[PDB]
A paper describes a structure:
There are no structures of proteins encoded by the MPXV genome other than computational models. The [name] protein that is encoded by the gp153 locus of MPXV has significant amino-acid sequence identity to eukaryotic cell [name] proteins. The VACV [name]-homology protein (VACV [name]), which is 98% identical to MPXV [name], is a late-expressing viral protein with a weak affinity for actin. Thus, the role of these highly conserved [name]-like proteins in the poxvirus infection cycle is unknown.
Here, we report the structure of the [name]-like protein [name], the first structure of an MPXV protein to be deposited in the Protein Data Bank (PDB). However, structural comparison of [name] with known members of the [name] family reveals critical differences that support prior biochemical findings that [name] only weakly binds actin and does not bind poly(l-proline). In addition, the analysis suggests that [name] may make distinct interactions with phosphatidylinositol lipids. Comparison with structures of human and bovine [name] proteins reveals significant differences in functional regions, indicating that the role of MPXV [name] in the viral life cycle may not be easily determined based solely on our understanding of cellular [name] function. Overall, the data suggest that the role of [name] in the replication of orthopoxviruses may not be readily determined by comparison to cellular profilins.
Residue numbers in the entry: 0 to 133
Write the structure that this text describes.
């Protein structure tokens, strides 16, 4: 599974619609498993993961030490496994977090990228990974 996390990031990186991405464990150590280098999501720490998976009412989470704003949250639902946010700083950009059996996939679009494209791209990656048991 470790190599595959990097393959997912590589695939995202080739697409000019996205600005940032990371895959972070949520089961055990909560370390960053793969990330686009030298951007915000590479800095996600365990204390940022726990509120996302625990607090039903999370609204202004810190992600890589910057605030984001939650506008839909079905992250812990087994059928949807996705949350939608906006950055809480300029330029306002769309974010989707999708949940596999063991990891969170964070994806940020450029400001011009549609909500649909970020959602479908992030969630489809999670759908594929879930089929492997990860």
């Amino acid at each position: 599974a470790m190599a595959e996390w990097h393959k997912i990031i590589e695939d995202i990186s080739k697409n000019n619609k996205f600005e940032d991405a990371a895959i972070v464990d949520y089961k055990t150590t909560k370390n960053v498993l793969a990330a686009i280098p030298n951007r915000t999501f590479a800095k996600i720490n365990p204390g940022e993961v726990i509120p996302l998976i625990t607090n039903h009412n999370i609204l202004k989470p810190l992600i890589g030490q910057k605030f984001c704003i939650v506008y839909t949250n079905s992250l812990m639902d087994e059928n949807t496994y996705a949350m939608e946010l906006l950055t809480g700083y300029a330029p306002v950009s769309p974010i989707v977090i999708a949940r596999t059996h063991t990891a969170l996939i964070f994806l940020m679009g450029k400001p011009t990228t549609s909500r649909r494209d970020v959602y479908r791209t992030c969630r489809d990656h999670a759908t594929r990974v879930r089929a492997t048991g990860n």
